[PDB]
Amino acid sequence: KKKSLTELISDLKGNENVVNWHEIEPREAKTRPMPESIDERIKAALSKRGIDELYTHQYSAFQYVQKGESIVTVTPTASGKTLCYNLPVLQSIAQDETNRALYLFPTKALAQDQKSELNEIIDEMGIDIKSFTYDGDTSPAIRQKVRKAGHIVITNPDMLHSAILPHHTKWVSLFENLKYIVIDELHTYRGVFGSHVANVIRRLKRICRFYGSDPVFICTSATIANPKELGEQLTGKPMRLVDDNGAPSGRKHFVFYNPPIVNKPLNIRRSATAEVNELAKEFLKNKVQTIVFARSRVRVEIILSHIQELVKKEIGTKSIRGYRGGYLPKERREIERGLREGDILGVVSTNALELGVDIGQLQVCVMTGYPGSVASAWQQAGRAGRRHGESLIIMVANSTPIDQYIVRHPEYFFNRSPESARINPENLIILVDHLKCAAYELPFRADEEFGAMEVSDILEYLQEEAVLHRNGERYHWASESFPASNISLRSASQENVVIVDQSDIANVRIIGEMDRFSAMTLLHDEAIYLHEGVQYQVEKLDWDHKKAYVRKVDVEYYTDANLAVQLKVLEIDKTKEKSRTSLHYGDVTVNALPTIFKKIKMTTFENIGSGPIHLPEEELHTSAAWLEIKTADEDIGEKTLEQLLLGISNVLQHIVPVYIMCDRNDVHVVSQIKAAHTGLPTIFLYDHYPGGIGLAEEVFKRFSDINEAAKQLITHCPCHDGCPSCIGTEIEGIKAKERILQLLDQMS
DNA sequence: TAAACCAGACCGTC
Ligand SMILES: [Zn+2]
C-alpha cells in the first residue's frame, strides 16, 4: 500500500490488461508580456492569482481582436480561455466607460459562473463596471435596471431570441455601443439548433447595424474538426482561428484497457463497470484526484454506490460525489466548487461534465467505455492533466463492437480527426420563422441580404399569408401576433418531470428533475430512483402534471427498464420504384411501449424479480423516408439479411447528416427486417423533431446522391471489411463490403 | 446517452 501516482502508472504499465499506451509529450508554457496599452488597474488586478504574463493564445486573441478581426479560439477552460475575451472587453470598458458587451452562453449556470468571475476581477480593479445576467431566471423587477446599467450582459441564445431582440427599443443603451459579442461554446450550436442560432445571430447583426455599431465576435469552441468554419457560418463574419496553446502541460498517459475474459467458451469479458470500480479504487485509496465518466445516469449511480462502498474503509465517506444533470442546481454547483477547491477527491459523472464548467483539473480520468464520438473521447480526456506533473486517462472498453474495434485497432482512434459541426441556416422552416421574427423587429427591406443572399421570394410568400405587408421597398409587420414567443430554438426538449419527496408531509421537498421521456422507464410507478447514492422509490407518477411523488427507501436492488419501440407508416404520399428497390416518403409514428421493468440486486447484479409498467404509449408523429428491398422467392438468409440491413443503416447514418448538413442526433435511421404493412426489409430515416423539419424530404430528394456518397465512403475507407466509420463490425461474414455494395448498386 | 431554454408592461383582483 501507500503508493504514489508514478508507482500506480508503473503498476499499470506492466502486469496488466492494457492494449495501447499513448504518451502525450509535456509542453512548457509559451508566453508574451502584458501589453503596455492595458489599463494599469487591470494589470494590478491580474497580478492577483499570478497573471503577470499572457499565454501565446491569450495574447494572440487580444491582438487579433484589438484590430477588429473576429476570432474563434479552441482553448480549454483550464488553459485560461476566459481571459481571451475578458481582457479585450474589460480593456474596452476601462478606456471608454460607455462601452458594452453581450456574452452568449449555452446554459444559465455557465452564465452565473462567468458573472461571478467577472465580479471578482472587476472588484479587484477600482472601476465601477456592472455585469448582469438576463435570462429566464432573472426576476422581472431587476430587468429594468439591467437594461440600463449593465455594461456586460450575459444571456442565452434562447433569451436573445425571445426577449432582447424583439424588444431592441428597450436595449438602445448597449446596441448603440456594442463592441464585443462573446459566444462561449460554439460547438454546442450545431445541427438544427445551430441553424436557429445562426439566424438569431443574423437578426442580432441587423439590430446592431440599425443602432450604428459593428461589434467584433469572440468565440470559444471545443476541438471539433471545423471551428473556424463553424464560427464563420454561425456569425457571418471571417474568423481568425487561435490554435497554439501557450499553457504549460505535463506528461499525459492515455491508455486503452480491455477487461479480462471470464469464460472462454461463452467468450464473455468482465464488465467495464467492475474493472472501473477497482481501478478507481486503487487511485482514490492513494488520495489521487480522479474523475469517472459513464455513459448513462443509471450506470453513474451504480459506480458511485460500488466505489463509495469499497473505498470508505480507507478514505472515508465525504470524499466521493456524483454528478449528473438531474441534480438540483445548488447541489451540483456545490459539487463543482468542491472539485475546484480540491476537497472532493473523486466524482462519478455522466457526459454532463464535458461542458466547459470550471471543476479544476483532475489527475486521472477513467472512461467506462468509449464515450461515443472522438470529440467526446478527447474532451473527456482533457479533464485529466496537470500544469507540470503527470496524469492518466484510462479508457476501459466494454463488450460493444465499437469498443472492441477501438481496442483491437487503436490507430483507428488516434489517427481519426474529431467530428465536424454542420449547420444549415437556410432550412426553409427555420429561415421562415426567423424571417418573421426579423421583420417584427425591423422592417425588412427586400434587397438587403439576410445571411448569404437576398430572400425576396419568402418575403412575398409571407405577405401572401397576411403576416407581412410591402410598403415602398420595405416589408412591415402586418400581424397582431408576437412571433418570438411561438418559436423555440431547441424544440426537441419539453417540460421536465419534477421529483418530489413526500416522505413526511411536513418536509416535502423537490429533490431533482428528469426529462419526461426518460421518466417513463426511470420513474414509473414503482421504480427506484438513485439520487447520488440516496435511494427513493416512486410512489406515484403524475404524468399529466409532470410530477413524481417518491419516498425515502432502503433496499437491496435497483430498477431498470427498456422501451419496446415500434414504427408504423400512416399514409404514403411519395414513392419511387426501381427493380429490387422502392423508396417511399410519408408520415410515420414512433411508438414506445413501456412493457416491464427489472429488479437488479445492486451488489451481485442478479435478477431478483420483475414488474409491470402502465404508462401511455409515447409516440412521435413525424415525416420519414424509407427504402424497402423487393425480393424474389430466391431470397437471402434471415440473419444475413438483418446484418445487411444493419450495415446499410450504418452507412446511411454516416452519410445522411453529412450530405444534408445537420447533426447525427437530428435524424434517426432505424431498420426493420419485416415491416408491418409490406412484410419487406425496410430502412426508415426520420427527423426526431416534432412534426418534422424537412430533413426526410431532402433525404427523399437527394437519396440517389446519398447512395452514391455511401458507396464512395464504403470503397474508400482503409478497413478490412467494416469499421465504425463505414458499415460496422457486427457483420459476421467475410465479404461484408461486397455484399453491402451489391445492395447499394441494386439500390440505384 | 445526456442535456438544455423560452417577451415588457399594464390591467384586474384579493
Ligand atoms: Zn471502414
Specify the CATH class of A31-242 in words: alpha beta
- 3-state class (DSSP) for residue A261: strand
Burial of A604 (0-12, 13-18, 19+ CB in 10 A): exposed
Q: Note the helical H segments in A150-267.
A: 157-159, 172-175, 191-210, 227-235
CB of residue A410 closer than 7 A to nucleic acid strand B?
no
Q: What contacts A522, CB < 8 A, 6 or more positions away? A: A297, A298, A514, A529, A559, A561
Answer whether A511's CB lies under 8 Å from A502's CB. Answer: no
Using the Cα atoms of residue A401, residue A407, residue A409 and residue A415 in order, give the sign of their dihedral.
positive
Please state, in angstroms and rounded to a whole number, the distance separating the CA atoms of residues A24 and A391. 10
- Which helix (H) or strand (E) segment is A307 a member of? helix A297-311
Integer angstrom CA distances of residue A149 from A128, A132, A139, A143, A683: 10, 9, 16, 10, 56
Sole residue written with cell 443503416: A649
Max Cα-Cα span within chain A: 85
Please state, in angstroms and rounded to a whole number, the distance separating the CA atoms of residues A621 and A644. 28
Please state, in angstroms and rounded to a whole number, the distance separating the CA atoms of residues A129 and A123. 9
Integer angstrom CA distances of residue A34 from A73, A180, A246, A375, A527: 19, 21, 14, 33, 58
CB of residue A324 closer than 7 A to nucleic acid strand B?
yes
Q: Radius of gyration (Cα) for chain A, nearest Å?
A: 27
Q: What contacts A9, CB < 8 A, 6 or more positions away? A: A253, A390, A392
Integer angstrom CA distances of residue A439 from A300, A309, A575: 47, 60, 38
CB of residue A640 closer than 7 A to nucleic acid strand B?
no
Closest-approach nucleotide to residue A160, Cα vs C1': B6
Using the Cα atoms of residue A69, residue A72, residue A73 and residue A78 in order, give the sign of their dihedral.
positive
Please state, in angstroms and rounded to a whole number, the distance separating the CA atoms of residues A527 and A539. 8
Integer angstrom CA distances of residue A566 from A115, A123, A142, A592, A744: 46, 58, 49, 7, 25
CA A380 to ligand 1 centroid distance, Å: 25
Length of chain A: 748
Answer whether A246's CB lies under 8 Å from A58's CB. Answer: yes
CA A728 to ligand 1 centroid distance, Å: 7
Solved by what technique? X-ray
- Which residues pair with residue A54 across a beta bridge? A32
Q: How crowded is residue A251: how many other Cβ atoms within 10 Å of its Cβ?
A: 17
Please state, in angstroms and rounded to a whole number, the distance separating the CA atoms of residues A146 and A165. 15
Cell of residue A304, nine digits? 458511485
- Which residues pair with residue A268 across a beta bridge? A263
Integer angstrom CA distances of residue A622 from A287, A590, A695: 52, 8, 11
- Which helix (H) or strand (E) segment is A622 a member of? strand A618-629
Backbone angles phi, psi at A513, to 5 degrees: -135, 170
The separation, in Å, between residue A106 CA and nucleotide B7 C1' comes to: 20
- Residue A81 in marked binding region: yes
Please state, in angstroms and rounded to a whole number, the distance separating the CA atoms of residues A198 and A235. 7
Please state, in angstroms and rounded to a whole number, the distance separating the CA atoms of residues A567 and A683. 11
Answer whether A733's CB lies under 8 Å from A641's CB. Answer: no
Q: Note the helical H segments in A536-674.
A: 638-659
Using the Cα atoms of residue A599, residue A521, residue A625 and residue A198 in order, give the sign of their dihedral.
negative
Whose CA is closest to A109, among A346, A362, A355? Answer: A355
CB < 7 A to strand B: residues 99-158, chain A = 106-109, 135-137, 140, 143-144, 156, 158
CA A612 to ligand 1 centroid distance, Å: 42
Exposure string for A522-556, b = 16+ CB within 10 A, e = fewer: bbbbebbbbbbeebbbbbebebeebbbbbeeeeee
Q: What contacts A398, CB < 8 A, 6 or more positions away? A: A259, A269, A271, A272, A368, A369
Residue type, A431: L
Sole residue written with cell 416518403: A585
- 3-state class (DSSP) for residue A297: helix
Whose CA is closest to A511, among A296, A300, A299, A326? Answer: A326
> CA angle A478-A479-A485, nearest 5°?
130
Integer angstrom CA distances of residue A242 from A235, A314, A321, A515: 16, 45, 35, 37
Q: How crowded is residue A123: how many other Cβ atoms within 10 Å of its Cβ?
A: 11
- Residue A728 in marked binding region: no
- 3-state class (DSSP) for residue A573: strand
Exposure string for A140-179, b = 16+ CB within 10 A, e = fewer: eeeeeebbeebbbbbbbbbbbbbbbbbebeebebbbebbb
Whose CA is closest to A324, among A364, A297, A286? Answer: A297
Using the Cα atoms of residue A718, residue A653, residue A586 and residue A678 in order, give the sign of their dihedral.
positive
Whose CA is closest to A384, among A349, A410, A409, A419? Answer: A349
- Which residues pair with residue A626 across a beta bridge? A584, A684
- Which residues pair with residue A404 across a beta bridge? none
Integer angstrom CA distances of residue A182 from A85, A149, A193, A235: 7, 19, 18, 11
Please state, in angstroms and rounded to a whole number, the distance separating the CA atoms of residues A714 and A711. 5
CB of residue A298 closer than 7 A to nucleic acid strand B?
yes
CB of residue A325 closer than 7 A to nucleic acid strand B?
yes
Whose CA is closest to A339, among A358, A359, A362? Answer: A359
CB < 7 A to strand B: residues 341-360, chain A = 350-352, 355
Sole residue written with cell 453581450: A102
Answer whether A62's CB lies under 8 Å from A218's CB. Answer: no
Whose CA is closest to A484, among A142, A164, A84? Answer: A164
Please state, in angstroms and rounded to a whole number, the distance separating the CA atoms of residues A256 and A523. 35
Please state, in angstroms and rounded to a whole number, the distance separating the CA atoms of residues A744 and A715. 12
Please state, in angstroms and rounded to a whole number, the distance separating the CA atoms of residues A450 and A742. 45
Closest-approach nucleotide to residue A491, Cα vs C1': B5
The separation, in Å, between residue A693 CA and nucleotide B9 C1' comes to: 34
Q: What contacts A342, CB < 8 A, 6 or more positions away? A: A289, A360
Whose CA is closest to A471, among A479, A480, A463? Answer: A463
Chain B bases near protein Cβ (<7 Å):
1-9
Integer angstrom CA distances of residue A39 from A42, A88, A215, A729: 5, 11, 21, 59
Answer whether A613's CB lies under 8 Å from A520's CB. Answer: yes
Cell of residue A463, nine digits? 405577405
Between strands A100-104 and A31-33, the pairing is unpaired
Exposure string for A300-311, b = 16+ CB within 10 A, e = fewer: bbbbbbbbbeeb
Please state, in angstroms and rounded to a whole number, the distance separating the CA atoms of residues A450 and A439. 11
Whose CA is closest to A747, among A683, A697, A686, A685? Answer: A683
Q: How crowded is residue A265: how many other Cβ atoms within 10 Å of its Cβ?
A: 5
Using the Cα atoms of residue A615, residue A498, residue A302 and residue A399 in order, give the sign of their dihedral.
positive
Answer whether A519's CB lies under 8 Å from A548's CB. Answer: yes
Answer whether A280's CB lies under 8 Å from A366's CB. Answer: yes
CB < 7 A to strand B: residues 493-522, chain A = 493-496, 515, 518
Cell of residue A491, nine digits? 424544440
Please state, in angstroms and rounded to a whole number, the distance separating the CA atoms of residues A376 and A291. 15
Sole residue written with cell 421537498: A509
- How close are the terminal C-alpha atoms of chain A, in Å? 65
Cell of residue A359, nine digits? 471543476
